[PDB]
Amino acid sequence: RTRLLDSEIKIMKSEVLRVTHELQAMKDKIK
C-alpha cells in the first residue's frame, strides 16, 4: 500500500501538535 504510511505520519503529527500547543498557548494565559 501507499497511503498506509501517510496515515501513520499524520497521526504522529497530531499528537505532537496537541501537546506542543498546550505547553505554549495555555501557559501564557495562566502565567
Added chain:
Amino acid sequence: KLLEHKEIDGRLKELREQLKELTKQYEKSENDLKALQSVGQIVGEVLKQLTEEKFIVKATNGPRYVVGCRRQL
C-alpha cells in the same frame, strides 16, 4: 487511496478550530498586562513660565510647584 484521510479530515478540523480560538484570548490578556505598568499623573494648570525648563504649576489638589517640562512637548 480513493478515500485516504478525506473523511478523517473532518475530525481534525473540528478539534483544531476549538483549540485555535483559545489562543486568541491569550493575545487579549497580554494587552491588559501591558497596561499594569502605566501609572497615573497629577493634574494641575500652568501659572507662569519662569524659564524654558522651569514652570510654576499648581496641582489641583494642593500646593504650587516649580517643575520642568518634557523636551518633546
